[PDB]
Amino acid sequence: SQLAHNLTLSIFDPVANYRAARIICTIGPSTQSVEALKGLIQSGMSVARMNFSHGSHEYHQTTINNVRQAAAELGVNIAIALDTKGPEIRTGQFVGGDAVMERGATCYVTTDPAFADKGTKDKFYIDYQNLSKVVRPGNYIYIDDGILILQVQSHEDEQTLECTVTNSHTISDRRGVNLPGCDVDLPAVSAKDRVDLQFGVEQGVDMIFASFIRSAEQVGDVRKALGPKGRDIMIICKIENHQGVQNIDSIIEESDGIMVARGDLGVEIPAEKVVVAQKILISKCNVAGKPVICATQMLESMTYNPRPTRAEVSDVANAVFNGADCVMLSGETAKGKYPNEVVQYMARICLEAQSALNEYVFFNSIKKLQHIPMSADEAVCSSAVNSVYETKAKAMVVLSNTGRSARLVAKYRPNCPIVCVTTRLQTCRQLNITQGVESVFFDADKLGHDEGKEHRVAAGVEFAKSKGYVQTGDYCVVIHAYANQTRILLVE
Amino acid sequence: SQLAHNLTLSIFDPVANYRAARIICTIGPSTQSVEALKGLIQSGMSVARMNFSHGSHEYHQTTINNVRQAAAELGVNIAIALDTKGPEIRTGQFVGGDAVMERGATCYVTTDPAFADKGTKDKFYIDYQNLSKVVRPGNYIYIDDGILILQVQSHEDEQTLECTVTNSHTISDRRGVNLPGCDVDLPAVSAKDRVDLQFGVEQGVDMIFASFIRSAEQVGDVRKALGPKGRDIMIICKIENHQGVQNIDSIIEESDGIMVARGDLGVEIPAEKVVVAQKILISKCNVAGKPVICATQMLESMTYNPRPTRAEVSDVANAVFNGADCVMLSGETAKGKYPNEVVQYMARICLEAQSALNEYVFFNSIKKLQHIPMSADEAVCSSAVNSVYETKAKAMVVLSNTGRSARLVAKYRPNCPIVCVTTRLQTCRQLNITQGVESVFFDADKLGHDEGKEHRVAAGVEFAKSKGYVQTGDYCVVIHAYANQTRILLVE
Amino acid sequence: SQLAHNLTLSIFDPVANYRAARIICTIGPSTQSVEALKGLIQSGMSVARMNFSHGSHEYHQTTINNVRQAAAELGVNIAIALDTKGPEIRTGQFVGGDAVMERGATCYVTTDPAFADKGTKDKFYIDYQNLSKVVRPGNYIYIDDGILILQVQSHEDEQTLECTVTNSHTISDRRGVNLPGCDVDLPAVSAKDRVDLQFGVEQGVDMIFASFIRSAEQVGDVRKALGPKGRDIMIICKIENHQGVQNIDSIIEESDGIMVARGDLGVEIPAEKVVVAQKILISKCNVAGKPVICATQMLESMTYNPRPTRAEVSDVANAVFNGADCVMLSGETAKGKYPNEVVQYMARICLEAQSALNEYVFFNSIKKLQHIPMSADEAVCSSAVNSVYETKAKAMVVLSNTGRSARLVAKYRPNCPIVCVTTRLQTCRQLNITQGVESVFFDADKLGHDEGKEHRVAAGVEFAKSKGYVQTGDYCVVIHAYANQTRILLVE
Amino acid sequence: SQLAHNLTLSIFDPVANYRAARIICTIGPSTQSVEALKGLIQSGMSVARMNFSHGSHEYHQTTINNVRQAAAELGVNIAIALDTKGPEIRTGQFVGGDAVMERGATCYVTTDPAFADKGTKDKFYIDYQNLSKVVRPGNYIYIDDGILILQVQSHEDEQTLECTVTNSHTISDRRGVNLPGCDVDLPAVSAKDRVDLQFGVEQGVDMIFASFIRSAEQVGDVRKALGPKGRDIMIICKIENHQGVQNIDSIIEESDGIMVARGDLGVEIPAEKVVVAQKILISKCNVAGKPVICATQMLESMTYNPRPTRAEVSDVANAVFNGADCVMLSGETAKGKYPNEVVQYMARICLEAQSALNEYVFFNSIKKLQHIPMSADEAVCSSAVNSVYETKAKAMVVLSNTGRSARLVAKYRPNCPIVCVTTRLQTCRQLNITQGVESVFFDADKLGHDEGKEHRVAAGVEFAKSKGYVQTGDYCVVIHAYANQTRILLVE
């Protein structure tokens, strides 16, 4: 009924008084300082992503410290995400630093280490040791962000494949390689990830964006890598090839959330198919009640120009229409010229798309898929959201300690803000990747367990009033405990 | 969707574990004694009806006292209803008390008082002074359960009517005269009624069944006759002629419920139209959320025979399928030979019908008629009944002091028992006219104010446990303060 | 949504311009003559039932001849039904013609033939030879329309059961017996049925009401009994005990329709359960698209009184509310005092109930149960009926040779008349047991095959105009071929 | 329910066997020759667009002739569209042709004609005489794709405006000046347009893409300029500014379809609001049952690069998800380097998106918006599409001379191909702007009038067979005469 809803809109009408979608910003040279982080917060950042593909621990420690200091000064809670380098397949080095590959030529790719330092156009190293048992004649090998394509012809021997060069491209040392038709069986985490995951645990990071996740079992290996002290850290799986797409259900089941990495998927999969995989993965997460992030190539052209292209604008709005909880900036904020303006524009686009989006369609499609009998939690949250639509309540207040009930309510897509009142700061930070929720910390050790829930409910209603969401005479729907209890409150 | 539900039924499956419909019994000489009342209660009586058309205040006082004593000895709460004589048009006296009226033969009816004694087969008497100025040229005067018809030709004078006798009836003193195309404008209540109603209030009756209600304003007259001390007594309007049916919407709005008096309706409305009027009135009260009683000609042949006719049984079951809260016995218990057996048989027909009735169709049809936005009470009660269906809960517990919210929940027809926990014994008795509710009295003088609700909630739950409605690991939906809080509780 | 529909009705509104339900009348002494059949036709009979439990072939031949002659004179098509005697279990004879059975007494029921002529209260014959292998100790034996109840105690020997008499009742010779807890395994048809079925085939009867149908296999035995020349005769199965109820699905599947024989069911099954089995069997037939007849004890009291009881009126309306195609009169027309008036009253009751009945509920419940993909026939008829609701068309015209497409359209319950145009008179007669259809004979041998369907469609539209169903500017929905073709016609 | 459909998809399943969306290509010097046009057709072009902003009548005549010749050699019918230059506000001439405008610096714009030649950086010229009396104190004058902004301060005189230059732009001769808060009241069509439109009619173009439509009355002006001989030519209104968007309902009602000109909208509406305007306009046309085209900035970067950006691909796919009938290429085919490849890639994105799009949501959303009662045509076409879903039919055949009913069927979005069988070659070409229809020309001069429809029906069915849409035992839904007859045919 989005179609029926479009009929009634006018683009000269006011936008909503709140933005539900959440903006993740990658921190780098343009943005690491406390003042630049403050600008990013004020522009609309909810999450600071650290790309551990680059920078040492010391560099990321400065990110960590500066985010906390910026957030403390503005009086907000900002989530910190550790995005891992992950396992990789790269070529070796070449004699003269470079290899000119020509359409029609035959070359040999080998996994023998002796060729690591001495590659040429005719024969060169690929560091993936299982390369030969996982490829068949006919498969393609992509190298250099998929620009050079080789076709496998035969096994020259146990370690060496004879390949045709399908297209001309010059490659330099240590380029990335992809196998679009094969199951890559590299481990879940690299040796470097293990070191980086431990550091992320020691430094209190909120979530991991775990690279190259291919199967459900690898999620548990990331979890083991985080150790017992890391058990509350969220694992968001980055879906980057066909195996991740194919195994999405069981991956979603084990993960705490999903990243749709469109540019990585796009190396292996036609761009038109990635548009469609983005729709599927996002709807499956919406149905699982798990946050989903739309990432890479979002307003890329605004890295160096003051304005993005019109197609990039439609990409960002369409991620919100698809159902994304979050939209993500990489080089635009890490190294770009206009970090503040890009985040501000991203927020505006999201806000505009949300004003057009019919939330009732998400609520109703999601509710119709529940199997009866529902459990108590599910019944209470979907009813509570139903009660919002039925009374036209203007806010929800959900008391949640771990954040579970807040995410379960957000899953059902009310058409008003959700204020989560929690007794854990780390819940305030982790809910920054859930659309449509804002969190209020209630310090139980300072103020009391509030067993009767009245102080926490008042803290929620007060926050909603300070934002203009509710006034005297409006309804607010309250949920508390996971969450088996609801009230419809008349606001004073 | 009753249709789809019918497909799945087997008459060899066991019946539901609770009976939702309520049985009202008229007390008379067969049934007035404490032992006979106890037999009525154990057989299924929830309400004792006093018919104030017969007997003295002292006689009704004894019914009151004995009902209270029988209920006390059984530990139950039984409602007491006062059914008013109401206004009437009595013919006067005749020659020796008789005449024979025949077809063709000319008759003259009088509004003049001197002819109160001296009547004939020619010219006689009627005490309704508005007779001539209401009855038009050609209308019908029924006199005696509608069995004698007379046709008003012309006004012989101001206080006389010139009449065809249109059939052969042999009548006798002081008759039920019936003016069917005629809007009878006798007042709401007679002098007897005003005196009887005051007695009712003095004696603490739970409800009035107010005879012959024709318009909404007449409901006000009953309420004023009940006065300041009668403000908590329910008024159930007895719909007995075409005007009450025409005016049904405004009558329901002013009243606390309706009795459909099929026999009386039938004096001037063809029987097949009364069957439909019954459907309309029941559905309008189901939507109003007010109790509705199906009365007269229920299991009549069981007054003197040990079993009813097959068409009588279907009448009672269809009353339940139509949506009645209550079915009522008149002579069958007041002066019949099988009072226990007729009540037990009524209870068994009700329970059989209920096991075939799809409550969900009721819930859904009613919910769909709700105006959006809903008020908080409406939204909370529909949602709680919705949650019963979604979680297949096995009981509801409703905290309700006045009974209002118990009735609001019952309106939506959950497919499990409702347990009202109440602090007023009069709410326990008054809810006896609401299908699908059992009330648990919580003695606040003797047990405290239970500000936390927890003692009342547990009393509710324990009652449900003692009846076998719920056991360990079942769900129960709990509602309370109007009613703006809901919980879905796992039974311990 | 019957409940929502009740809210909008008024009993002073005009009834529909057509009666959809069909009245079956049993012919006897009060009604066998041509003038009395003419009166019955004019009063509303569509079907003349012959009860072959009584009368010889010669008697029924007069019924057959007189129905045809009455129908020819009035210019209508009347269906003729042969209702079989069927297999029976009876007691033998008693010494002195009579046996006084007393609560508490022991008696012996035996299947040894030697006792056929010499029964007494202590020991007597029951002609069902498998009696002893089919009963267990604890079972009941009903005798004399279920008035006398025996309980089986033990097997006295291979042929004799020792029984307690549970209640006092005097029985006379050759009384009927029932076994409520046992599977009766008598053959489908008696020796007498076979002779009567052959006669019915020779005389061109339209349908058989086949007595005591217990399982699906017995329907095929009735069919074999009718022989190759009887293959177009409809078999309507009379459902009279628990086995028929239990096996209803597979019976419906093989039968051409169902009779719900409430009084026979009521011998074995509590009357409250029979109310419910009537609902189930009728809805299952509505879903199967097969006619269903509500029979026995319909307005029984109007056999000797000029008016029926109010409960009997509600029984007839409630059969139409349940979904019956037909309602049936037995002694009321066969031997009663008021045959014309009873049929007229039955028609009026049906008409009144139909005016209140929400046909859209039947259409929508039935449509939602179809499995997708539907076959072409089903899709065309349900769409055609949907198109009636959508355009508010005022009639349907369905060209059907065998009557199959007309019954498939009637199954979907349009809210307008259906005019079936058929090239077989016997289809005109057989459709008399399908609600909501009237048939027009088109003699193809006289007028042409009408391959372009225009003359048959005009014959339908003309009939609809002559009845007042449609006028200039109204829509009429036309279906033709079973039936894979639809048009929405503007009436000229 | 798009949401539920997303859950079931796999990007590794095969694509649909037909592409429903239609591809429009702008002809220019890369593409004008018969061979290049043939390459366009085989690559997926259904419509040749002539941009009458450039080139002479002789030049467009050659496009016309070559399109017809290329289509004839391939045996297909291709639509020809004339896109009008439309009215404009050109700045005049300058000093040497240039100036540099900077921030702060004062500028004076003139409506006086003597300054047509002699302009400066100070004071220059604009040919829109209503300039001063439309533009208010403080409004914006954009001049050059919106890149130069100027702010109107006050009226320096009657025919002059006193202006802040609010940025640094260095402009040049005869510019696209843009008055964004301004309701531009230039007439509907210029003199060039009236001359070009008459040429269009003489040359038998199928449709007009009418530039810069702002109001409904303006549609009349186009139609009058087309005159009596142009009455069958479709008018597609190009929506290019805020007024066309404000007035969208009445414009659609008067027009035969809409083009959403994103680039032009974007001059005065922020890009994120144009994304939403696109959603609104497409849905309003889907409900109107009129073709809607998504145009400008489609795969722009593919004008000179061998591949588009990833955000461009998503733009095209989302155009299809929004519901567009047609996507349009401008410079990409008019002067680009890869005209064949851009069309083939467009076709592949369209087909990918379609395989993910749930047509049923469209069908259902549209059906629900229909007013009851429906007219016969509406009811027949929705029902026929409903029958496709119910029987999982694999094709529709629609007989439609003018194309009206083909478009009415397409509106309801069956999930199978529609084959229109038509007697007019111009209906074959005009339906090229309606998604999901292929047209089969039935030559009535050469083949007869087919009064029985049977030859046209079989031509439809055979075409569907030759494309592999249906084989033996599939269903096909056939609709014909407006369209008031339907058949569900089993394929032989």
Ligand SMILES: O=S(=O)(O)c1cc(S(=O)(=O)O)c2ccc3c(S(=O)(=O)O)cc(S(=O)(=O)O)c4ccc1c2c43
């Ligand atoms: O390969 S090493 O760099 O020596 C290395 C060091 C450590 S460490 O001592 O804990 O730091 C590892 C800890 C845990 C590992 C697990 S597990 O999740 O703990 O079960 C699985 C695999 S596997 O390679 O996928 O089979 C591991 C491979 C290599 C590991 C470790 C693995």
Ligand SMILES: O=S(=O)(O)c1cc(S(=O)(=O)O)c2ccc3c(S(=O)(=O)O)cc(S(=O)(=O)O)c4ccc1c2c43
């Ligand atoms: O028992 S008799 O009276 O001698 C007698 C006479 C004839 S008749 O020659 O055709 O008239 C029978 C014809 C067909 C019969 C069939 S069947 O449907 O044809 O298969 C079944 C049974 S059964 O008893 O259920 O096994 C029959 C029982 C007794 C029959 C006939 C039966």
